[PDB]
Structure formats: C-alpha cells, structure tokens
Amino acid sequence: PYRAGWIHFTNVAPILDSLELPPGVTAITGVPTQMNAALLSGEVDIANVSAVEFIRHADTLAALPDFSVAVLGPVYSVNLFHTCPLPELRRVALTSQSAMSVALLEVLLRQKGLSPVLERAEGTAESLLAAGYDGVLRIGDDALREWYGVVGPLTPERTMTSLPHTGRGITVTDLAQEWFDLTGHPFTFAVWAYRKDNPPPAALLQAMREARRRGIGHLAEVSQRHAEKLGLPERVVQHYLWNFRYHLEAPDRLGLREFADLAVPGHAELTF
Amino acid sequence: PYRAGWIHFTNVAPILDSLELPPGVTAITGVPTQMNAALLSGEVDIANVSAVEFIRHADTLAALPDFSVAVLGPVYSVNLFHTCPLPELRRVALTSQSAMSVALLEVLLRQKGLSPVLERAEGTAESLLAAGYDGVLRIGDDALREWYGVVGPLTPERTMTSLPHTGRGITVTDLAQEWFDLTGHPFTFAVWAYRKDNPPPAALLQAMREARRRGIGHLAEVSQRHAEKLGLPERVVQHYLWNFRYHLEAPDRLGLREFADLAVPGHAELTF
Amino acid sequence: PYRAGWIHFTNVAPILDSLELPPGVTAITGVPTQMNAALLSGEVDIANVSAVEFIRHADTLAALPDFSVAVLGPVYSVNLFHTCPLPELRRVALTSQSAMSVALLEVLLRQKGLSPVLERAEGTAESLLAAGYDGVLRIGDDALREWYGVVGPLTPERTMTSLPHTGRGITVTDLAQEWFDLTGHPFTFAVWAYRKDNPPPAALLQAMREARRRGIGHLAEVSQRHAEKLGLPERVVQHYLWNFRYHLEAPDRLGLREFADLAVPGHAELTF
Amino acid sequence: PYRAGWIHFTNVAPILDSLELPPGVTAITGVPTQMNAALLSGEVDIANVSAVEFIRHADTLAALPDFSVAVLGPVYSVNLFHTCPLPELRRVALTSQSAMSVALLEVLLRQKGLSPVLERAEGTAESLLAAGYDGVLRIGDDALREWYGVVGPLTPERTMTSLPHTGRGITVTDLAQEWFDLTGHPFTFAVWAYRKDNPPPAALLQAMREARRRGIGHLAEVSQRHAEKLGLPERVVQHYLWNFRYHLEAPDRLGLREFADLAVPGHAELTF
Known about the structure:
Pathway (chains A, B, C, D): Quinol/quinone metabolism; menaquinone biosynthesis
Keywords (chains A, B, C, D): Lyase, Menaquinone biosynthesis
Order of helices and strands of chain A: EHEHEHEEEHEHEHEEHEHHHH
Helix content of chain A: 25-40%
Oligomer: homotetramer
Structural class of chain A: alpha/beta
Largest sheet of chain A: 6 strands, mixed
Number of helices of chain A: 11
CATH topology of the largest domain in chain A: D-Maltodextrin-Binding Protein, domain 2
PDB class: structural genomics, unknown function
EC number (chains A, B, C, D): 4.2.1.151
Radius of gyration of chain A: 18 Å
Protein name (chains A, B, C, D): Chorismate dehydratase
CATH superfamily of the largest domain in chain A: Periplasmic binding protein-like II
Strand order of the largest sheet of chain A: 7-6-8-5-10-9
C-alpha cells in the first residue's frame, strides 16, 4: 500500500543498511534515472533523489525535513578527473548520465568563466582520459574507487585528508570542495522526496530515524561491509561516511538553497 | 620523556578513550588553568586546549594540523540560558572560569551592539536565573544536561535536531548556532597544541589517529559509556558526539581564524 | 623552598635591585609568558606580573596589597607612535607579544569607536612607520628610548614633563595619559601575584618592603645604574622612576578595577 | 635684585634644601602670614604660597607651570583630629592663621551638610581635644608628628601606608584623602607665585629645577636631616616626601581648578 524507491549508494548505507520496512511499505532499488521517473509517475511514492531532481520539481514534491546527503568540504564521490589545469580544459566526458554532477559542474565552470565542451560518454576516468578527453566527471562508488586508484595508497601514517590531489599525471578535483571554496557553505547532494499530496506514513519515518541511529552508532560495521565489496580499505570508507551530513540542518538547507538559485533560477519554493 | 596533559571532556572521548600511548610517552590530567600553564611552562609537552588559549599564545605554541573540537551549527554544550529576549539582557551570570565561552559570548554581544553586565556567580542555570539574572552562561556537561532539561524529553518520533529552543519560559541560545548565523561557518572550540620548540613524536600522532578511528567507528559504545555517567539518554550523547568535527579541516580553521581576528586582535599567526 | 620569578624591568629597579632574599627563598627570571605559566603551574610561587595577567586569573591568584607599578598621567613606556591623527589610524603594528599594552590600546580604541587593524610586526617605530603602518605600539625600554629619540633632546633649561609630544612629524601618544584623560585616575600596569593557596613568607615581604625603601631613598643611584645600559640621560631615568606609584593604594586599585571591568568583563574578583 | 620668600617646611625640602641662588637673587624665610603679606605688598617677588592664596589673588598673580606641592590620596600633614564621628562633631579648633586649611575643611564639611562651630584656638591636637574640643585641625610638621604620635608607632614588617586611622580614642582624618574620596583627583596645596608683570629670572628657574633633581635623587639623605628635627623615624619623613607630587602636572591642575571652583566660585582665571 506504499512504495519506496531507494538508490543504494555507499553514502547512504548508514541509513538504509539496517532499515526495517514497517507494515504497509515496500521498497525497490535501481538507478537515479529509474527512481526519478518512478517517483514522478507513481511506480514509487518516496525516494532519495538528487538535489537537482528535487529542486526542478519542488512544485509537486516535498522533502523530509531531517534527511539528507550533504557535506562541508570534500565529498570524494563527485570528482572531475583531468590531465591539465582547469582553465586549459577543452573536452569533458560526463559519465553515468547524472544531472546532479553536471548541474554543479556548470555552476562552477560558469563562475570561473570557463566553457569546455561536455559530452555524454562512459568508461573509467582513466579510460576516457586516454581517449581524447581532458577531463572526466564521475559520481558514486566508482568515483570514490577511481579517486583512490589515482591518489593513495593510504598508509598507516598521516590521515586520509593528507592524501595528494594528483597521481600518475591525473588530477582529481572534488566538486564539493570547489563549492566550499566558492560559498564557504555545505552542499546538499540528495534528499528524500515524496509528492506533496501523498506524504509517507509515520512508521516509515520512525523506522528510518532508527536505522540511522544504528548506522551512525556503528560506522565500523557499516564501513567494513561496503569497503569489502568496493575493494577499498575500511578506514577510507569509514572516513568517507563520517564526513556526510544526514539531518538536513540549517547549514545544509542554506547550501541547498544557494545552489538552487544558481542552477534553477525561478524554481518553485523548496518545502519540507 | 614526552608528557601529555589531557582533560577528558565528554566531547573528546572518541579520541582519548581508546588511546594507547606509545612507549616513551606518558599522560596526566587536571584542570584547564593548570594544564595550559603546564604546557606553556614545560611541565607538559602536548595538551588539548581551547581555541582562545591557543590563539593567545600562537607565537610559542603550534597545533596539530588534523585534530580539533569544532562544530558547524549547534554545539549543545555552550549555552546562554535566559528569560527575557537577548536584546533585553541586563545581567548575565558566568558559571565558571571559562575564557573560551566568555570570549565567544563577548564577540557575539559586541557584534549585536549589546552590552549586558557579566558577573561570576555560583549555581545552575535554573537557580541563577531565579536569583536576579536575565541570562546564565553554562558550558560542558552541565550545559548539555540543563539544555536537555529545559528542552526535551526526546521521543521515538522526534529527532534531537528537531528539539525546540525554549521550555518553561527559558530560552536556550546555542553560541555555536549564533556563530553560524553570523558567519555561516563552523566554530573551533579546541585544538591540540604543543610548544614549537618541541614537536610531538610521530608515534604519538599515529596512536592518536588510530584511537580516533576506533571512537568514530564505535559511537554507540563511546556514547553508552558516558551517557549513564551523565544521566542522559544514549541517543542524546550519540548525536552530540556525531555532531563534532575532529579533523581541523579548511572550514574549521576558517572559523578559527575569523574568531581569532575578532577576539584577539593582533594575535600571532596560527601555525600548525 | 619558596621560589620567585622576577622579570627585571627597568621600572621595578627601585624594588628588586637591592632585594636580599631571605633564607629558604630562591629566584629566577625569564620572559613574561614563561614566568606567568610557571606561576599558574606551580613552578614559581610569586612573580611580578602585568595587571591583565592578574585580572584574567583573579580566581586562582591574589596580589600583594602594597606593591604595584602604576602611574598617574603619562608612563613614557607604553607609547603609540603615529604620523596621522588617531582617528585616521587604519593599521597599527605591534612590536611584541604583550597582552597588557594591547588590552589597554583596545579599551581606548573601543571607547573612541575606532577600530584599526592590529598586526604583529617587527622593528623600530620609525622603520615600521616608513613601511605602511599608520601607527606602532611600543612598550618598555625601547618605547622609552624611542620616545626620547622623537621628542628629545632635553636641556638644563626645560623639564621632562615639558617635552613636546611630536618630533619629525611623529606624534607619541602615551597610553597611560590617554587613560587619565578618559578616567581621571591612575593606571596599574603590574602587581606582585601568588597563588591564593600558597601565600608568601613574611620574611620575603619584609625584605621587599625594605628593598623598595632603599631604592626610593636613592633614586639617583638606581637611575645612574640603569641609565647607561639604556643609553639615556640619568635625569630621564630618574624622572621616569620618580613618576611610578609602587604602593598599590586606593587610587591605584580604583584604576585597576575600572580597567578590569572594561578589558575583562566578568573577571573574577580581585583579592589582596 | 629679585627677592624670594620661602616658606620652608619639610614638604618642600627636596626642592629648597640644596637650592643654589644665582647672582641677583636673595631669599627671606618666614611664616605663611609673613610671606603672603610679603609677596602681596612687594617685599618679596616670588614665594611658595598656598593654593587658596593663589586662587584668591589669581587676578594679580601667576604661578610657575611646573612647580607644586600636591598629592593623590593622603597628605599626612593636613589632619582633622577628633574623638567622635564627624557627623556628631560639634566643636572644632582651628590651630593656625592658615586659610588653606580652613578653606579645605569648610568645603568638605559643607559637602557633608555638616556645620560644627569653628573657632581659633592654639595648642596640640591632644591638648585641645582635652580642652573641650571634639575636633582639632592641624597642618604642617606638627600635623605630621601628632598624626604619628596617635596612630604610630611603625613596625619594620608593616608599612606606613597601612598604618591605622585611630589611636587611643583619637581618629585622624586626612583632608587630602577626603578630597580623593570626593573627587577621585589629586589636591594641590601650594604653588610658586609672583605678580604677573614681575616674572622670575631664568637663572632662578634653572637653579630650582636642578635643586629639585638633586632632592628627588637623594630622598634618604633629605629625609634624615628633617626626621631628626621633627623627632620622627627616617622612613616616615621619607615616605612622606616620596608621596608628594612636585611638577604641577595635568592631574594636579585638574584638582586645583576643581577646588578653585568650589572654594572660590567666580575666581579669576588661574594662569601660569
């Protein structure tokens, strides 16, 4: 009697990994593209969609008031791999058809007065960069893995935030970090949205806030599982998760709003 | 050999709790005043001290680059309890000797053009607010308990991020929140400083980093332990700790610098 | 054994020059930061500290009731050298680490609604004034020497209290004089402090009272001795010393408290 | 043939004792009454008269700009001896033909709305207090040793500045101190005056300034001579002299004008 469309990225494991769907709610997973359409149509009633998806449809959609995937500073999962200073960037490859990553990239390039050519294309950052592209935008787990594959290994000495930004000629620019450099504020990448008319049941909300307590309470357990199926050290994933802001607090709402005004001028009002 | 002076505050438990000192280093504790002096005089080589303590001695002291006690938004343990609204404040009680809290309060008041009289008084927020005081400034565990006392109790449906700021006619103004409304940046309350002429052994830094991973990796465990000792629900302490920023990243030193300029004009350069 | 941390500033020569330590009491010296720390730490039991140092620790420290380093009117050693009128000051250099002078300068600036930026710099008043700074703050012997360098020389015909306040387009603003024009009271720069839990031995006090008596009784002598190592006329040094108030009397305590209220709101009560 | 009329009591010893009159000047000593009359009539060209004498004749007289007999707080030689609290006071003996003393006493008594009967009588504070007077006003050297005879003796451990105010049922009220409690400012008891049109020769001013330098530089030596004559401990005369402000600086002129306004409303402009 109530569907939900999750997009199980690593960055959301502290919330979804222990969730217990209450009586009356079902869940199904897939890719951003999938869930988005599902939410708008009705194949699903609630989903974790990108900030851009939510902003573009704020007219008919509402977001939970205390759930988000945000950060202040590096995110490590929204990376632009390039082999030449940004200003010299001429051709960029956009992977996994992400409107979120692109929207944020355009805002950043725009402010810098840049305008390289962007093209849909698939492959690893290293592949595409060896196939004519100056830069390659990547998001999600693959973005995290490839980031690590370039910089690091992360040795017992000196923290993860002590890793270089370049490796084997490739330079990894964190878009969330760029946003901080630009606004000094956090950036919100995703939220939980539902149609203003069809709000979720209380049970689901409590069930979710409880799973989150568990996830945040045992990051070492959450990290290990995923680090293993990601082929990454536990500490990398643990730090990666610790770094996320999940309660859509004022600082997150501020960043979300700053971005919404720059990428979707005249967007309906953002409600929660 | 290398002597460390720790002050086991609740907010640094995730870092010190599982700390195993390397061979050749020992640790003692005491009150801040005593611990800061010891560092400055040479009785101790490294200690966790307040931002203001570090700032005022940035010429003989340096701070570990990846360690801090900061927050973005509310901190919950640096509160100004008051009956009338802020602009009406005429008398403010100062619970204890805390250069850090008053320094931040003064910066906030000065900014708003206000200038209520500040007096050292003895007691709790409730009692002092009933003995002729418009506002009472409290810090630490007492501040956290009294905040939860005025607000809350918390329930399965609610989130701590959703608690009201007033109860029984008592408003609780979070100074860290105020600092965000003002600067939009995070605030750094403490750092790990050492005399420049005596850098810490690499072995100690690695031991500290391993201890922080453990604490961050097991928040539920660090939380239960200190919650009972504080008379607070595990979840209150858990979110409390999750809320802290421990790696002194660019956004944290940005806030630190801003505060520095406002509270200690002409301070020596902050070096890490 | 009772230990003392003396810092032989010129203005204390009348007191410490001929001090004969009682048996069972030793004495060391060093830089202010070092001695203040040692005192609060427990390494030193009594020391001649600045008024700010005392005020900021009035809860743990107490001061001898009849010993001070205060002045009514000019002090000649806490000078703000500037080329443009005070209201036009945009950036002031701080020749050294001195919480005292900075604290006094800030109370005076806030009072006049002025807020120039304060930066730590290195060098003489004239060199720094010829490198972008509108004003330079100097304390101690260098301040005295530079003041004489600017407004001097002095002749048999005229008195020291008659020297102009300008020379070569440089105006020397005496901070103690600014304090008088503002409050009409004396200013207390330093006191003799000890930890409340460890009062000094009567034999030391008596030795001190006796030593001051000798210095005050032979000012020409104390002066002739320091006015040589300082490169100054005996008369400049004699008047400089004669001009100090050493008994921490009612008027001096009045000034001290007025300053403590402004510079250190909420400071602990000053006890003697 | 410039004539001088010195009123030579202990408080001016540091200045006159080693005075060396240049060619063309002579000096005649005597009592206030003689000297004042002598200055006014034309016998003497310059004399160190009381502040009241100067103010009341400010129309025809001018005073030296850097010479004075003033203090901040007690003066120890302008005392009101009494056997009952000031309010219950009802019979005060005026011990001399000094206007300086009664002027100050009356200004003070009126400020407290007190109005005991005042009448001229001759004798020591103790004899007159035993001859039907509950109050006796004394000034000068006798005032100093009768104060000591009451509140003394002085012990090596205790300081003069901490000597009691009462003795054998006799309270000594220091009028300079009363002035401080009333204005927070210094009091000027005397200046060096001369008829406006008959200024003193340069050689005399330089002779005076040099003598002052010598006296202030050797207080112990100056104190002994006078202590013996007065039958007082050397340290008493020494603190007494050390306590005097001799340069007629701004703080002293403020106190002078303050007094002038109260005691001689509408007085002529004081000129130097």
